[PDB]
Amino acid sequence: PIELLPETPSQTAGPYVHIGLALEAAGNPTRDQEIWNRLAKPDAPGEHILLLGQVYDGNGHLVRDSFLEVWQADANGEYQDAYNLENAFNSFGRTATTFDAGEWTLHTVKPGVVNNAAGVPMAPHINISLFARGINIHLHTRLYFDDEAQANAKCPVLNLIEQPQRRETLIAKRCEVDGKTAYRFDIRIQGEGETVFFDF
Amino acid sequence: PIELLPETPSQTAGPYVHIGLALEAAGNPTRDQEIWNRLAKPDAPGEHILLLGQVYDGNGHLVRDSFLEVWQADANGEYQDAYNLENAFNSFGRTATTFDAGEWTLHTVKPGVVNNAAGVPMAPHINISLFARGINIHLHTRLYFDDEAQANAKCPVLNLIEQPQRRETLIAKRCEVDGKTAYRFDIRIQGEGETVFFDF
């Protein structure tokens, strides 16, 4: 068969990922421009929300060294790929859990609906990639929202998860942090309540 | 790199380990001198204690064919390597679980504090090696004491166990048995409450 050049293999991001990719989270000095966890300036269109969550290992213990990258549509269902700290909205961001702050946070807007390649609407989602010590190749998942139940029930991606019980692991829970709209999305890497992880 | 002669590989002690290493426990005749479970004669200096425990597999079922070897300091924190049945104290002993007696026992004194190689005191402990059918290479653990909470908290060995919840698996529980001081140290080879095992 046709064999292309093999892809460079993945390795773990290791315990010091933050020194390269999360400088402030590493407690080290920052450069003039850093890719971080505030996707939306206050003037960005849409509903401004806080996302937060904790990451657990197979023993139920906190992962205190994880690194997360997110990618989402803006409120108008547009992916903003021209990354710029001066943008009202960036579709891309980064966050982390650390020894001092075991719970990651992201400041964003609720993403608008985008269609899959067959033209079927997907429920509002954030694409997440999770990296850490002990994780040899990053884990892909999606964060959906518990107040989009009708859309979620019809999502062609959620419907590829065979068991309803597993679909629930991807649904973030609406709450309030210091009185502001937030959604909590905890990730369980292994075992009871294991979060669905994707391949694509 | 430099490669030495390889170590002879381990194999399981098998179901009849007691015929070779625990003759009385095997229900077989003993020789004049046997290495057994009385580390201390009545007159030995220190606090005389009874130790006991049960061993469980990954399905929570009793292991009724275990063989244990123990190594501990005297009450003064000194290891006594000159093994002799005439000694008031020996630092080494053996015990077993059998079909007739699923709970092993040891008759000893509480060990004194011993420093690590860096000069830092370790909490009082008994070194244990566990052998049985199904165990291909023996499992190393330590038995510490629940009435040594202050020392346990500062032990440089205990502190190498990353999770607090796992450190608790090495702490034996004080009780009284027929008016005499005793501690129970149960071992769980696998699964919920799995005992910490060491490599060194």
Next chain:
Amino acid sequence: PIELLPETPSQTAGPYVHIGLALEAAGNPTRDQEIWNRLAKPDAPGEHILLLGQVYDGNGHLVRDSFLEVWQADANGEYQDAYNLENAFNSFGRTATTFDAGEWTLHTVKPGVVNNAAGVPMAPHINISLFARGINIHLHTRLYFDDEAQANAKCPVLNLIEQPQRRETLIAKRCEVDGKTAYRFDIRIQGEGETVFFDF
């Protein structure tokens, strides 16, 4: 390690190099345009000078079949790569020693000072490549000027020659030829007074 395509290996230019590269010197008919030994037309800016020399082998005998290529800055210290016979000055030229004329000549101007890559001025010099039968790969040298003693003393290239006595082999001797300023630069390929040759 990384291995690129190997360079095509050098071979000697052989005894008839002049038929291909010095047609007039070969006693053969010339084409309309030839690359020869007049780098400067009369009007070119700078000090007009005649250069001349003889080439000796390791037995002190004249080399009567040499081919030399030269590369030098204009009087303003700029290299002029756009080779054109209409130019008042070209930075490149060719000359030769033959059976009829064992002493090569060049008609040029004295080159201006050029800085090295570190910004340090080099003394005025002409780069020379020497080819002949018996020379398997061409020999690189530099012709400097005896009336530039102060600059020569500070030249970062001359100063890479470990021994003072060897630096003297690169210094051409000022004279007058028919009332015109000239310098003699003799080259000794081998043995007593052996000319410094460079690798770069």
Next chain:
Amino acid sequence: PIELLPETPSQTAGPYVHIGLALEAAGNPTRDQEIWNRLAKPDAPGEHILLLGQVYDGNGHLVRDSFLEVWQADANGEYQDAYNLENAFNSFGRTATTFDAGEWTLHTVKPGVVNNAAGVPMAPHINISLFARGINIHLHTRLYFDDEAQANAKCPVLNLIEQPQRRETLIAKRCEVDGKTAYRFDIRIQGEGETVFFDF
């Protein structure tokens, strides 16, 4: 044939030999005890002499980074091998040439006569080993004395040098340094007047 383990191959001592073997000559701080160039305390028996010399390459240029080790009998013809800074006499010493001091010196006594293995007297000599950048395996030689002409003419080692002219290269010349008895022993590594070097 019988083949033993091969000897570890020699390499050049390199340009920085002095940092390891001639600390004071390297201009670096010394340790409490150093092996150096004063073989004899003033009370040592025999005729106290200064040895000095310069080392030349094949171009007639000074070697300004050489390192020399010497081994000689005491004045009584005894080799003193129990090296000690408190000894009246050490048969072993070290010296060097450097950028600041191109001429090495050694302070010693004139060695007494020793016999070769056949019982034949050798003329008074110092065994020398020469190390430097550019010298892949050290060069062995001997320094004999010009005021021992009768002994030199009968030396069974000198007589193994086929040519009288080459024998002369090993004869140090008596002179006076600051009015004290000295012998100069220059070494020419290569070319005209090349010093005899030994294999044994």
Next chain:
Amino acid sequence: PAQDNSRFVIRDRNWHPKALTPDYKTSIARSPRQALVSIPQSISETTGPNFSHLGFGAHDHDLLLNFNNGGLPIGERIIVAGRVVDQYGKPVPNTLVEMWQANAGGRYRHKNDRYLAPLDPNFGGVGRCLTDSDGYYSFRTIKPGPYPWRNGPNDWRPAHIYFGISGPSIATKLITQLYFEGDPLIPMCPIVKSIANPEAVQQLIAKLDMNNANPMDCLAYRFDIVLRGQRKTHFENC
């Protein structure tokens, strides 16, 4: 805004390391036990950030100058350079390459690293570069040292530099580790050995590159990175 106009060759997850590689102890509790769920490529997966408009500092790619506290870092001066291409051999221009590492003694500039090898007051260990129009990147740094870690009782990481590469989409994004030609620690390392295929391990070994060295100055190593092959869509929804 971004559009869905391409597809990416599916990953070979037997070429990459698997999740559960128990010799690497931390992987035991941090590996999913359920199978990954395959999903088709949509705009969500086939797009991603482009960093052409991120403001880079003058020294962002130069670790010998980007943590300057009065001197040069101690250690082996090296250029690390290479090309980012996809599996079809097409260069990946204007893509973000980030890197980080320990100093010459194997010590990281992070509070959690308590290894007794000292910090270097002139070394931070962090760099980034955007590939040029032909897919090439380069950093200047010192060669990191190996260091011990609490895996087995005598385990040591080979000298390595972490790399992250964005590529054209979130589907292409990768983090890996670069190792150095000839390092005898490589075959011994349980993290290297998380990769089952020896040929895949070789793709992570940077080669000494004398052709790219600065004479009398610094050596060079070459590390080429291959991201998932990108193609146009064809015959979809018909």
Next chain:
Amino acid sequence: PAQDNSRFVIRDRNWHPKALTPDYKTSIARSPRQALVSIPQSISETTGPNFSHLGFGAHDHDLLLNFNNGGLPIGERIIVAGRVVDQYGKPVPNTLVEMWQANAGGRYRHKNDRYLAPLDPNFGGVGRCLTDSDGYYSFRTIKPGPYPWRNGPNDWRPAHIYFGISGPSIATKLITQLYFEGDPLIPMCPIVKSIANPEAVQQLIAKLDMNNANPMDCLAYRFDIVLRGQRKTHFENC
């Protein structure tokens, strides 16, 4: 004027022939006995003449017509063609390739050649060509004959054509000799054997190229030339 913006891969002087190769007798007295002195590349070494505006005659590359005295030369009609590239595989366009050779009988048009094989009244043996925008050159000529020479008592040069190539700088300039596929004199020649590495010798052997021949007219040989790799400066004086 010319600028210093590039660097050239250092030569492998064990790939090239060494200076002292005593079986080639003339090298004995024409080889330096002191070591070459290495110097850093400066603008002096990394620039050189560009011959784009040298004015070539119509037949400068055609040795069948450039010495026409009433007829065609006698001998094997051939095209000699190839590409000039650098070690990175980059073509070298608009570069000067000069060549010269003996006639079909091994006789040179120089007064010093007294070999008894006659001169050909319609052959001069000299050519030049500027490589095109893709690095290609071509000459038309007759295949030169081998000839004897006063080295050992029965030494013969294999058939060969001399080549000189300027390239981008005085640091890339090269003279070499082209030999012909299959020639049994090649392994016997002390000038060929000045090259120690047999793989380097193979790089000087032109291959029969039937694909480039003119049927019923002339054969063709292919000789590609590789000059030193050229790169941009990086991390200098910082």
Next chain:
Amino acid sequence: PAQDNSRFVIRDRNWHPKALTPDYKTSIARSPRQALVSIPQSISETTGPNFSHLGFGAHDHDLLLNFNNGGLPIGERIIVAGRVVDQYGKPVPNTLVEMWQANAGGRYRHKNDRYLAPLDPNFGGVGRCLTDSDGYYSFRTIKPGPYPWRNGPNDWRPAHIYFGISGPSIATKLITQLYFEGDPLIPMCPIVKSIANPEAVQQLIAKLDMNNANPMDCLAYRFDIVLRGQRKTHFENC
């Protein structure tokens, strides 16, 4: 005092590097052109200094502590250990082993070294040790870096430590260089290549020795040294 009671196996000067190795440029003018003169072993050659009574300082073998100016040196912490034996396999006890080296960046603590890689204020690079009763020595140090040198225009020494060993006599005394397992610079180095036999080169390469490492602390390398075989005299003067 010393006595003549032993003989030493004659050296193989085709196993050692020869004097004239012109690729190593300094050797050209520093190699004798006359043959060495062979002489028989006498007391002058078969005796030599013993250093049992030389006063060593507590840190003489520990380069991490013997140049202490307020901290530890930066770089890869290593033990270098091994055994000195003769060619008959007999250990050489109570013998002087001296060593010196550059720091982690390839910079020597000597005025003449002007390489731009900085000095380490806590590293001197000098050690000595007397072998124990079983022939063993050990040093603690940091792994030296490679460095450029003015030989060819892009020549670099592999990482190395100089060793001098006295042994039982002046006939056994040796200076050599230790190189490190897997270093890709070794095959390229003209000083290494002064040794013609590839197997002899291998005897200079220290092997990574994990068995001798201090976990969580320092790696170890093993370098065994073989001096000339020593035997009793037999059947002399009869």
